[PDB]
Write a protein that binds this ligand. Structure first.
Ligand SMILES: COc1cc2ncnc3c2c(c1OC)C=C(C)N3c1ccc(Cl)cc1
Ligand SMILES: [Zn+2]
Length: 349
């Protein structure tokens, strides 16, 4: 309760410092954006979101920065890597003007592996040219860097499609009773992205932009969190959920049980709790303890039932036995139940 606000304030202590690191990050990205716009196929490249910390909100350790590069690919033809609902092959509709991505084609399909390797090469060729800071490219996110040994920058390359969302998403983003039918309509008119996540020809759908948008305009009231009277704890509940998983993942690092779990799981579950608790009166700042519990309780029910539907792709189950093993889900359940029933000691000093 007061224990939870102490943790959120402690999570602020680190966030206050970031100001020096954010500037060093932007200097590298912009120099890499200019070197890419030189290339024939990467002329339409650019960063997704413009804001502070450069989309750092993933890890509560303020050193890991995640940046997304986008590239508009018009007249796109998506062919589902059938029955998966989320992974697609990239085909091209009409051939009057030859597309700059011809070099990455593997027949009709656009190879993500060929598209990545050239991208990965261009910047590695540019790192040795950098005389300002010390950049170390680690390959295992499409590309990763270690700026000044302290800063870690994970670069992701995404295709942008300004067309209608795939039929698999038709029944997703069920925000109607929370954010409204008007908002759903407006969000679905926005573009969608595809990330190289493999069959080294397949790309997975990305809605990181929609997610960010609904988190920064998350109430039923348009003035939610805009004044002292309408302050909810939606954002704090997500921050605590993300922090719980980070603390447990770090606790059991050399045990590989939680390797399949990520903050995406905790963000998905959170949006499902927002859909079931659509009223701003269900997220009052004074009720933080119970709201966080509602999030913990719902996550525990997802683990036990082995059902965590993708919030955009409802037939895609993130907790299927094909994605995460029963033992792994049962192991996370045991750890979270211990936390819940012991007043989250993993949050203590
Ligand atoms: C929009 O749809 C998705 C977005 C994602 N954004 C991040 N990570 C995602 C997704 C997934 C998606 O659904 C198809 C699915 C999975 C398994 N993961 C994921 C989760 C945990 C770990 Cl360890 C690695 C990857
Ligand atoms: Zn709010």
């Amino acid at each position: 309760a007061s224990k939870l606000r102490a943790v959120l304030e402690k999570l602020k202590l680190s966030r206050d410092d970031i100001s020096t690191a954010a500037g060093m990050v932007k200097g590298v990205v912009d120099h890499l954006l200019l070197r890419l716009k030189c290339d024939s196929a990467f002329r339409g490249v650019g960063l997704l979101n413009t804001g502070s910390y450069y989309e750092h909100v993933k890890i509560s350790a303020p050193n890991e920065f995640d940046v997304m590069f986008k590239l508009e690919v018009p007249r796109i033809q998506l062919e589902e890597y059938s029955n998966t609902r989320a992974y697609y092959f990239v085909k091209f509709k009409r051939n009057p003007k030859e597309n700059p991505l011809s070099q990455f084609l593997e027949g009709e399909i656009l190879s993500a592996s060929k598209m990545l390797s050239k991208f990965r090469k261009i910047i590695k060729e540019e790192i040795n040219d950098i005389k300002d800071t010390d950049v170390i490219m680690k390959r295992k996110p499409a590309v990763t860097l270690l700026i000044s040994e302290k800063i870690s920058v994970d670069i992701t390359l995404a295709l942008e499609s300004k067309s209608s969302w795939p039929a698999s998403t038709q029944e997703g983003l069920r925000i109607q009773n929370w954010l409204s039918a008007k908002v759903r309509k407006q969000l679905r008119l926005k573009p969608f992205y595809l990330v190289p996540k493999h069959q080294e020809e397949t790309w997975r759908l990305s809605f990181s932009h929609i997610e960010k948008e609904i988190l920064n305009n998350h109430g039923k009231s348009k003035t939610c969190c805009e004044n002292k009277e309408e302050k909810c704890c939606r954002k704090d509940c997500l921050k605590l959920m993300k922090y719980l998983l980070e603390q447990l993942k770090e606790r059991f690092k050399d045990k590989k049980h939680l390797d399949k779990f990520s903050s995406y799981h905790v963000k998905t579950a959170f949006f499902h709790v927002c859909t079931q608790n659509p009223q701003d009166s269900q997220w009052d700042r004074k009720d933080l303890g119970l709201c966080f519990d509602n999030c913990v309780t719902y996550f525990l029910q997802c683990l036990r039932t082995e059902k965590l539907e993708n919030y955009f792709i409802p037939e895609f189950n993130l907790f299927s036995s094909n994605l995460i093993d029963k033992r792994s889900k049962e192991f996370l359940t045991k750890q979270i139940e211990y936390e819940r029933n012991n007043e989250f000691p993993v949050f203590d000093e």
